[PDB]
A paper describes a structure:
To improve crystallization, a number of variants were produced to reduce the surface entropy or to truncate predicted surface loops. One variant, containing a deletion of residues 99–107, resulted in large, easily reproducible crystals in the cubic space group F23 [Supplementary Fig. S5(b)] from new crystallization conditions. The asymmetric unit comprises one copy of the [name]-Δ99–107 dimer with the entire polypeptide chain successfully modelled into density, except for the N- and C-terminal regions. Both the selenomethionine-labelled protein structure and the isomorphous native structure of [name]-Δ99–107 were modelled independently, giving almost identical structures that superpose with an r.m.s.d. of 0.12 Å over 257 amino acids. The remainder of the structural description will focus on the unlabelled native protein as this should best represent the natural form of the enzyme. With this structure in hand, the crystal structure of wild-type [name] was determined by molecular replacement using a single subunit of [name]-Δ99–107 as a search model.
Indanomycin is an antibiotic from the pyrroloketo­indane family which is known to act as an effective ionophoric agent against Gram-positive bacteria. [name] is a homodimer, with the individual protomers consisting of an α+β barrel. Each protomer contains a deep hydrophobic pocket which is proposed to constitute the active site of the enzyme.
Numbering used by the authors:
A (entry chain B): 6 to 134
B (entry chain A): 7 to 134
Write the structure that this text describes.
Amino acid sequence: HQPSDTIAGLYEAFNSGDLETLRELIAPDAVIHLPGTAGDAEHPPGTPRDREGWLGVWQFTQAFFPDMTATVQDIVQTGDLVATRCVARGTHSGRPFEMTMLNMSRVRDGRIVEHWTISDNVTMLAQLG
Amino acid sequence: QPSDTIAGLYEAFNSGDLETLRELIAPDAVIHLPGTAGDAEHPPGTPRDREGWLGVWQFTQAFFPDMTATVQDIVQTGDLVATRCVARGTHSGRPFEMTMLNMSRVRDGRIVEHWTISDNVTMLAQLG
C-alpha cells in the first residue's frame, strides 16, 4: 500500500504549501495531464506538463483561492496506479465552495511519474456566481 | 467482478445498448454529473438517478454521434472501480480526443454510485 501513501502525502503537501515534500513526491520529468482550463499561450489544451509546470499552475490557482484545500474522499489502488476522488473546499470572498476532483496517478519508487486530473469547475462557479 | 461491470458499461454506452445499461445501473443509483450537465431543473452539484443520467447521455450521443469512449486504465479495490477513458470522434471533419475520469461503486453487479468528469474545454479547443 505504498502508492496510496504517496498520493495521500501529495494532497497534504499541496494543502500545507510544502514545496520540499512536493518535489520529493513528484519526479521532475513526471508527465502531468492537466485539464483544458489550465491550457495557455505556451501549452494548448491536451499538452502534458512536467512537475514544475504543474506546480506553477497550482501556485496561480492558490493566489486566487488562498484557503483552497483538497481532502481525499475515496482512493483505489491496483499495482502502481492510484485513483482518487477529492473535494476541493474554499471560500471566494466569504462565500464557501465545494468542488469534486478526480485524479489518476502512476507511482514508481515512491514518486509520481504520471498524473491525470480534472476538476468540476462549472459546479464551483455555480456555487459562487 | 466490479471491473467487469464497468467494462460492460462503457461497451454498452458505445453500442447504444439501453437494455444492458438498465441491467448494469440500478434505477436508484446516485449519479454525480459535472456542473456542465446541470440545467434549469437540475442545478449543478445535484445528483441524478439512472434515468436522469441516461437522459443526459442520450443528448450527448445525439450531439456527437460518432463519439466512442475507450477504457484506458481501470483500478479496483473492493466495491469501488475507477477508470480513465478517452472519448474519441470526428465532429464535422475535425478529430477530437478528450480524457474522462470516472469512479463507480458496484454492488451485486450493478452500479449504485458514480462520479464522472470530462475534459470538455480541451475537446472544444480541438474542434474550435
